């Protein structure tokens, strides 16, 4: 559990090639002398698999993913592979599956096992009286919350140590889809020394384990043999290959045994067989698939750097209004860059409420209302929902869901003179509370008592529009801050100043993905020589195909060229002589994709011969190919 081995030598996992491994029965359908196409997770041919062994310096137990599906293939001679650990996070917090075998019964239990540091099983005292009896149990520590347990039939497995070549071939399929684990197995004797065998075997399922859990990582147990940290192992080999959702073609004989499998995503020869559903390729050009160039990135070309919003008359103005007779200004039909308003280094008060200023870039609003008023330094913090004071209860009250901003600047050399500034006024007395977005411009004399005031001052009759005090003998923070409050809301009107993704992006002569005002598509923007009309924005072909557009805020003449698309034709002779092919893509060029230029595309795979022979397989425009010496 805690004691780990110290004989681990770090070796690089080099790449290994596979020939035809990863073939098994897809479902419970028995077929014979037919050719059916299936869609399931299979091992791709000539892919990249792992390279690990179980030797007495290299003792490696790596952690491999499970979300893509793995394939297991091991060549054994002394029954070294014992079991695997099917878990999610390799801890005692989630539900895991542990399938081991102590050569007596197939132990399949679904519990909450405790993942140890390095589990290992071995045989003790190999000097004398071995008898192949195991006693060490270091696979897991505890097992609780068991919901399923499977006990197989008792048998006797020979775990003797053979020397020389391999005698057993045990392969497994480890995949899980929709909570249904499928386990396959196949055993056959082979002859092998070092490399991977280029054979063919179909795997049959043994049992069905509907665990219904998620498996992300897994390990592999190994057997140990040495004549509690310096123990060694024997000699074995195992390979792990990642599964992919490919398509096979299982060739059934008269008895039902799978004899051939063809992966359609390996070579252009396989594209002819997976299309016509026949391994016997006849003479003639056959269309298999369609080539298409994938786009690189999405580029939106809505805004530009011109046609800015009129913020110069708002932020750099001379005189403003008071807090009771403030003016409401609407700003729309422009583009406002919020990065040049943040790094101006001239605003002494720049606050925002509701949402973050870095999050409103990918967010569209429809109404912008600037509320500019002149207050003191002790009244800026009262512009907040759920507050009291001389502003929120008397002059201006914010609503609850206010997601606006507060923008102001310093007025040390603008509204500060010697003598006193009696320009602005403010209301001091009021009977009731306020409402959101309410303007009060009345000059009614407040009646504090029961006697009327008749518009003049007297007993309990004070002037409500009190004068402000701005003197040079006051504090620094008591200067009149020109507070401009922005308003934002959501209505049925569409958005005006939002910005799609950014300002501008210009990538020419490439297959990119554009985004226009009324149509989308993928094409290449190339040069042109026509003279379009300045008020036009788009342009169509005969049968309604967009091919030439104009930028709305930039006078440019560019067309829309479609990318390199077309069918894929495989030129190959019959399978009775050879298997060489000729890759031919239709409606392509020899630049974007032994290179020969044809009228139908770029032919890569055939050599140019000046000698004219008889036509065997047609290509196009009077060109033929023939498999001759």
């Amino acid at each position: 559990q805690c004691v780990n081995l110290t004989t681990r030598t770090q070796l690089p996992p080099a790449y290994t090639n596979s020939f035809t491994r990863g073939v098994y029965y897809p479902d419970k359908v028995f077929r014979s002398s037919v050719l059916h196409s299936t869609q399931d997770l299979f091992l791709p041919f000539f892919s990249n698999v792992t390279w690990f062994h179980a030797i007495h310096k290299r003792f490696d137990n790596p952690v491999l993913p499970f979300n893509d599906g793995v394939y297991f293939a091991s060549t054994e001679k002394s029954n070294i592979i014992r079991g695997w650990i099917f878990g999610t996070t390799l801890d005692s917090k989630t539900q895991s599956l542990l399938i081991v075998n102590n050569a007596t019964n197939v132990v399949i239990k679904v519990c909450e096992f405790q993942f140890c540091n390095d589990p290992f099983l071995g045989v003790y005292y190999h000097k004398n009286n071995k008898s192949w009896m195991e006693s060490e149990f270091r696979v897991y520590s505890s097992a609780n919350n068991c919901t399923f347990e499977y006990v197989s039939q008792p048998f006797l497995m020979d775990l003797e140590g053979k020397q020389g070549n391999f005698k057993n071939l045990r392969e497994f399929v480890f995949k899980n889809i929709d909570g249904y684990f499928k386990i396959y197995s196949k055993h056959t004797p082979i002859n092998l020394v070092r490399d991977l065998p280029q054979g063919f075997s179909a795997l049959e399922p043994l049992v069905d384990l509907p665990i219904g859990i998620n498996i992300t990582r897994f390990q592999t147990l190994l057997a140990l043999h040495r004549s509690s940290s310096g123990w060694t192992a024997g000699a074995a080999a195992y390979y792990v290959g990642y599964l992919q959702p490919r398509t096979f073609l299982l060739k059934y004989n008269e008895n039902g045994t799978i004899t051939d499998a063809v992966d359609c995503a390996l070579d252009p020869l396989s594209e002819t067989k997976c299309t016509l559903k026949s391994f016997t390729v006849e003479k003639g050009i056959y269309q298999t698939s369609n080539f298409r160039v994938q786009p690189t990135e999405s580029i939106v070309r809505f805004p530009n750097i011109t046609n800015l919003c009129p913020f110069g008359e708002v932020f750099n103005a001379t005189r403003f209004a008071s807090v009771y007779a403030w003016n409401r200004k609407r700003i729309s039909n422009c583009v406002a860059d919020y990065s040049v308003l943040y790094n101006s280094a001239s605003f002494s008060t720049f606050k925002c409420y509701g949402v973050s200023p870095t999050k409103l870039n990918d967010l569209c609003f429809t109404n912008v209302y600037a509320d500019s008023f002149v207050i003191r330094g002790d009244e800026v913090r009262q512009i907040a929902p759920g507050q009291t004071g001389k502003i929120a209860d008397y002059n201006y009250k914010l609503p609850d869901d206010f997601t606006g901003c507060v923008i102001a600047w310093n007025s040390n050399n603008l509204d500060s003179k010697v003598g006193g500034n009696y320009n602005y006024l403010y209301r001091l007395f009021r009977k009731s509370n306020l409402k959101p977005f309410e303007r009060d411009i009345s000059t009614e004399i407040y009646q504090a008592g029961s006697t009327p005031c008749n518009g003049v001052e007297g007993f309990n009759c004070y002037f409500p529009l009190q004068s402000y005090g701005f003197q040079p003998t006051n504090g620094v923070g008591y200067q009149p801050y020109r507070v401009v409050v922005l308003s934002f809301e959501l209505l049925h009107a569409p958005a005006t100043v939002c910005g799609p993704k950014k300002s501008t992006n210009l990538v020419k002569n490439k297959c990119v993905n554009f985004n226009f005002n009324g149509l989308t598509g993928t094409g290449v923007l190339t040069e042109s020589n026509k003279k379009f009309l300045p008020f036009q924005q788009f342009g169509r072909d005969i049968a309604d195909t967009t091919d030439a557009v104009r930028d709305p805020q930039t006078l440019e003449i560019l067309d829309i060229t479609p990318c390199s698309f077309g069918g894929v034709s495989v030129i190959t002779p019959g399978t009775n002589t050879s298997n060489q092919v000729a890759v031919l893509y239709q409606d392509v060029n020899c630049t974007e994709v032994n290179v020969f230029q044809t009228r139908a595309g770029c032919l890569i795979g055939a050599e140019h011969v000046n000698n004219s022979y008889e036509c065997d397989i047609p290509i196009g425009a009077g060109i033929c190919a023939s498999y001759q010496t």
Partner: antibody, heavy 118, light 108 residues
Framework: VQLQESGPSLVKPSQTLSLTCSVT????????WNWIRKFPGNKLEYMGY???????YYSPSLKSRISITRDTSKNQHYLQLNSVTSEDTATYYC?????????????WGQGTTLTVSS | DIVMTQSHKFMSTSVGHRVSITCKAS??????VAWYQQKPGQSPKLLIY???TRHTGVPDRFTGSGSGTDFTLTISNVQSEDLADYFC?????????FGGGTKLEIKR
């Protein structure tokens, strides 16, 4: 301008607090005098300030239980914090925030720890 | 109210490494960002004013930048004398709500 804090370090609850932020070296001409307390546990909160004009405003957490007076004769100002609780036990400071020669500066003092307990 | 939220309360910085003290406030404050330097047993002092100019008496190993609500106090050449507490503050308006503070740790 040098700063010095003084006053009693033992304030009974539900009573009137008293402090004296001594200002020596330069008289109150331009600038404010804030009040920053330090709770045990690396948590900070603002209390209030006073100017040389006659306008006093404090934190919104304290509605009307704090009053700061001024005295331009002895260049000192007192801090009256009425109805103190057990959570008001903190280290009280006084500082000043005023620019100089078109550059921002910040002066600080020593500070004293006041314990409010029964 | 102005909520000043930092990244972590306790961090670790060895001698010679570069630590990026980030204080991601929920509300935007503009460019009025100042930082404290509080030794254990003393008063905090001003370090960086207006986020672009160092204070008189402070060496050139203290830099500061940031964009939006994601500020970064890059502390270069972290020595043994720079072990202090940092507090993101603002001189915009009252009350001066301060952050929690980030304490460094030298590994040896």
């Amino acid at each position: 301008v040098q700063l010095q804090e003084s006053g009693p370090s033992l304030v009974k609850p539900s009573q009137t607090l008293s402090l004296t932020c001594s200002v020596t070296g330069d008289s109150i001409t331009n600038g404010y005098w804030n009040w920053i307390r330090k709770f045990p546990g690396n948590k900070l909160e603002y209390m209030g300030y006073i100017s040389y004009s006659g306008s006093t405003y404090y934190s919104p957490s304290l509605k009307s239980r704090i009053s700061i007076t001024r005295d331009t004769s002895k260049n000192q100002h007192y801090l009256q914090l009425n109805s103190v609780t057990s959570e008001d036990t903190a280290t009280y400071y006084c500082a000043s925030d005023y620019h100089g020669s078109k550059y921002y500066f910040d002066y600080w003092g020593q500070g004293t720890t006041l314990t409010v307990s029964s | 109210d102005i909520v000043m939220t930092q990244s972590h309360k306790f961090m670790s910085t060895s001698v010679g490494h570069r630590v990026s003290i980030t204080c991601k406030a929920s509300q935007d404050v503009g460019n009025d960002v100042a930082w404290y330097q509080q030794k254990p047993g003393q008063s905090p002092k001003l370090l960086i004013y207006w986020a672009s100019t160092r204070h008189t008496g402070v060496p050139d190993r203290f830099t500061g930048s940031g964009s939006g609500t994601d500020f970064t106090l890059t502390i270069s050449n972290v020595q043994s004398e720079d072990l202090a507490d940092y507090f993101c503050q603002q001189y915009n308006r009252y009350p001066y709500t301060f952050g929690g503070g980030t304490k460094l740790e030298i590994k040896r």
